[PDB]
Design a protein around this ligand. Sequence first.
Ligand SMILES: Nc1ncnc2c1ncn2[C@@H]1O[C@H](COP(=O)(O)OP(=O)(O)O)[C@@H](O)[C@H]1O
Ligand SMILES: [Mg+2]
Length: 327
Amino acid sequence: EIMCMIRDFRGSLDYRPLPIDEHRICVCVRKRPLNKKETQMKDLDVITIPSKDVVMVHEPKQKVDLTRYLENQTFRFDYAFDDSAPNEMVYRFTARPLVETIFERGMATCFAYGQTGSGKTHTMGGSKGIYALAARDVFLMLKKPNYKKLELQVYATFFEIYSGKVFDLLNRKTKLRVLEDGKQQVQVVGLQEREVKCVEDVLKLIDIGNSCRTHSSRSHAVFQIILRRKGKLHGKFSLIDLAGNERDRQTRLEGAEINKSLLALKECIRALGRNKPHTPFRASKLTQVLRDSFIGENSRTCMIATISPGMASCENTLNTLRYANRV
Ligand SMILES: Nc1ncnc2c1ncn2[C@@H]1O[C@H](COP(=O)(O)OP(=O)(O)O)[C@@H](O)[C@H]1O
Ligand SMILES: [Mg+2]
């Protein structure tokens, strides 16, 4: 009944799924498919991405006279990825253009933002996750004649921000202090920086930090790819798998700290587009550590808003699209 109403509406859509456009700030949405449990649990798919560009939310509702209808809210982003877009498709329009940024000596960031279960970690971490696909392209760019002559070295860090504090995912969640005030470069004191020479070196670090992290839904994981000349910084790509945006004492603290930081993040990304001097990067630990990825002269950012398609997730989806729409 509700399912027919949905099928009858999709049948009217012109499916034109996803040529790279340049954005200083790139905001995108990615729908994940219904999983094997949801599929046998009868649950319904309330989200359609018919176009390169467009997200449709069509929530089934029923009136007091028993009339059923679809509550249709449409959102427009730089890109939208349907539930069968693979990681490499998503990567191409998002993190891939930013790899050139860091060789041109810029600071790049890529955030995965959305509810727990929606696909942030699938997108960023997982050989087919965004950390690794970027790492691949970094080592390939490095062989190009412009960059071959530079004597560049590549390093990686993997850390988390949990409850307003930093912990090293490459060193057993050891708590680290951050020194920001008056420093030319923000210093995360004691943070393990590891030289990597191929994708395989990076996959090992991602595997290590992920099992350290896993709590994984209540912290931001930051993976960094760092270019260095002679120990001197050439560029940095920071890749962020954010804490779930969905909203006892420890639990309330984590959520208050998460949401504080997502407000700060939005303001900082917007400052990056309009007014870098007015970047409120001190509003959270997440944005403080990344100060220089918002205020640097050649700073570029990307956000992938991940959404679950289920009717039961609908309110959460709308909150995610709303926030992404306002960045
Ligand atoms: N686009 C996708 N295609 C296939 N499976 C996915 C996709 N996105 C997420 N999943 C799967 O759904 C589950 C939850 O995803 P995850 O990325 O762990 O969510 P989050 O990090 O947002 O909590 C995992 O089992 C993951 O493999
Ligand atoms: Mg996750």
